[PDB]
Symmetry: C3
Amino acid sequence: DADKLPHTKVTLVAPPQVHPHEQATKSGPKVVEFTMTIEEKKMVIDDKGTTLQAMTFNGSMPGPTLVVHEGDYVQLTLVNPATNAMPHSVDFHGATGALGGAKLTNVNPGEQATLRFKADRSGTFVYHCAPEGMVPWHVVSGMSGTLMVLPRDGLKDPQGKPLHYDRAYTIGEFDLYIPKGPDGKYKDYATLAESYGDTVQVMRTLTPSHIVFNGKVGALTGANALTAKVGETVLLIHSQANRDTRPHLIGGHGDWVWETGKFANPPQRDLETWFIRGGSAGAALYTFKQPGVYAYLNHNLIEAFELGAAGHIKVEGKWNDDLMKQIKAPAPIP
Amino acid sequence: DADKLPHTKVTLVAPPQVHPHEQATKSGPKVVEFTMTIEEKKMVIDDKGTTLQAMTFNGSMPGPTLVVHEGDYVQLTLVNPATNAMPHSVDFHGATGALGGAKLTNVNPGEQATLRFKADRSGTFVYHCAPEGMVPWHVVSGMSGTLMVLPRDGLKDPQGKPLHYDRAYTIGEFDLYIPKGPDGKYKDYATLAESYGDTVQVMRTLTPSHIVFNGKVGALTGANALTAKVGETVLLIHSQANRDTRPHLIGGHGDWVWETGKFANPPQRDLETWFIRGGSAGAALYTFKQPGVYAYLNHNLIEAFELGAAGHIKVEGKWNDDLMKQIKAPAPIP
Amino acid sequence: DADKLPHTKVTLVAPPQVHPHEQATKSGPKVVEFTMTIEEKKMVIDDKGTTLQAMTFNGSMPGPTLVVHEGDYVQLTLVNPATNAMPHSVDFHGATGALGGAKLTNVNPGEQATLRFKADRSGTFVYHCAPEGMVPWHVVSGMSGTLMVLPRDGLKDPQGKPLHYDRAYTIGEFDLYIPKGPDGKYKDYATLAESYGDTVQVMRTLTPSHIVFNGKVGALTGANALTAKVGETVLLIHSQANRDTRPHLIGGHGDWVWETGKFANPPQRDLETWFIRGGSAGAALYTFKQPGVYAYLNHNLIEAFELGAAGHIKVEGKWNDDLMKQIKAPAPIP
Ligand SMILES: [Cu+2]
Ligand SMILES: [Cu+2]
Ligand SMILES: [Cu+2]
Ligand SMILES: [Cu+2]
Ligand SMILES: [Cu+2]
Ligand SMILES: [Cu+2]
Ligand SMILES: [Zn+2]
Ligand SMILES: [Zn+2]
Ligand SMILES: [Zn+2]
Ligand SMILES: [Zn+2]
Ligand SMILES: [Zn+2]
Ligand SMILES: [Zn+2]
């Protein structure tokens, strides 16, 4: 059909939000049009002013989440402005053929391209830049995000019963490899190209200098904490385009989790910690039962607390003493 | 109900054993009372006398395993004696709210607190210390163990048929980060506080100096080997509160494994090696079919053999030639 | 039965091919005889002539894949020629008892042994050398491969429907630990024994110098690329006997994947990236829908592109515009 089908245009929004969309839908297949514009820029990634010579989709790490339904066609215009120094492309893990689209979206600065592919498989899928010979650098420098392809009748549990979320959040976790000089301080680079050789040396050690949600230590804390309320079901989409992570909600659970991120498979329930394979996006549902400030983090606690892979969720509502109660507050031992 | 329910008191036992308990039970929900007392102490962790400035629940690494049934309430008195230097708390991954209980169990030396929570989800769950600003250090220094919440009707296979174990063992695997001095020898510290800064430096490299079962290289070997017999089904509970591991039984299998450790999910069968995500506890059932000395180990063989993540299981009984037979012993090539 | 049963002899073939075999079979159980001869040799592992003092089964990394059916007995003659310097053995993860067979196959140079075991569990299973006190070194130096034990009625999907492959490939991924001298260049060793101490130092850092498919950077590229055609279903068997990996097919998927590699468990579908636990073999089915050159790689992109864990699959056939179409080729921005 394709060329026969109706088209719709979607306006993308910045992480950690996800653009408005339906879950279960009575709509038939559409060509869903998206546009993204690559921005290279220096970004401050921690609380002591370390910078990253970063590369982004639409100015953010991660790039925005694109949401369609199974059977839809994704039609992306990828724009690489002449103000950028490097060629780029996009590899959609949700797509079939031509290195995910990368061979057909090879754009030099001042060019754009339009790729169409059929989203014939449900799930959360990573997309990332994949320019020939420079793949890992472009990815670790920030160029990834999530395509979510929802089943046309919405999410299902292992018995085929309906599942839903009331709010979606998208978290991209970024293993960064910032070089240091002879003084042990992080290097600051005047240009993207100048960061390259030293960064590759760091990459090859396999030890990140920082591991951050959404582009910086503390990105999802303070004023920028995620929010929910008791009784609300959140979807937490978690992408890691290069390295394994193990998400966990402190004082919560993964009620239903697709850790490999593919919705035609039954989810697991009651998880404490789940596993996102480097090069993938997964999805967890949780319904809040207690108010308070939760942490959502990578449960390698070093990676979380020392290197930056941790955020907060501030939840409104009424405390539930049946679920948890302080029987005796801290007080002197008898 | 809660405040209406009967109470029972459980006496904890040292790993690798697990306190006596029922699997399937005709008992209704209870408030099950536990107590644990934190002990900070220096411990020798390898065969060359390296020490760790350790922190423990009840004097052991891991802390003891607490066993209840789904629908029970866990009521823990946590005691931090004035002979300890640091504040502590407990975060139960099996609990809902208040950072796992951590916000309600913040105990300075000379204090205790009593926390109650509903164990409303079946599985093996990590619990660990989580004091504000010092979480990874307290965890890697030894403060973790397992809460096992058994379904009220016992374990089930993927078709809903009953499964059981005749003996449970609990194995906590500890990634340690022991600093070295300019001479390349491990540092020995006079106090817990003095170990801190140097240990954090090591932690941030993400490379453990040692990875040990149950507190020391060779903890589960020699006189301290696990034991079983042909025909006996063992449960191996495996916790790793900070870092991924991949358990394996040499010459055996995981007959039924919940690698994410949550019993409402169907187990997998016939595993060679399974995966415990950092920040979780999993469970494997195996029924011994051959006598002999098995290894139970982390199948990154470096981590196992060089760094310490390996134990033994000595199994009694009759050799089975149908399962395995030496047809020709080693002898000269013809 | 065993001693009653018919015997068959199988001729092994070099990776990445797998010896001819049936999937579903009307044949009853057999004693299936195999022979392998250990070869120690120096091998060049990258494009700049770095060498590895390697140890192999049948002269290749990985060793050859052995294929039987559930209920068959594997009977392996393991030959260690007097031209080798070291003792060897074999541990079959598919076997039950005696440390996988290792205790019964302990062969010094100039000896051979014959081991029989029942392949009573379906799946892909690692086998590897396991000589007492030298296990990790022998494994990381190249001594591993795959035993595939097919269900007697062939592969099944989660609903019990038949699945099949038209071509099997076997990929062993090898984390290598090549030492360097004071000049920062890789060391070349005159003998296997001389490589030992320095290699163990590298191993303990847990950082591989190289991570290669099938014995060398680029082993599965150029003339040596894997091949298939549109409409053909390939099985990709992936073993990693020491360290975790995360396979991915760029521009493809895992249509059906047993990432833990055990066929009595239902596979997952539509995977972007899957996970092979160190110490295991997994299996993925994919049916090609687009022609072109695909990459099959470890999706830690550093490990793939910088360290060597990547291969190619060249696929013949007709491009499918419904699945993917370049709507606008790269061209100047309007
Ligand atoms: Cu790019
Ligand atoms: Cu990719
Ligand atoms: Cu503590
Ligand atoms: Cu935790
Ligand atoms: Cu060997
Ligand atoms: Cu093994
Ligand atoms: Zn149209
Ligand atoms: Zn809702
Ligand atoms: Zn009461
Ligand atoms: Zn029994
Ligand atoms: Zn015979
Ligand atoms: Zn076919």
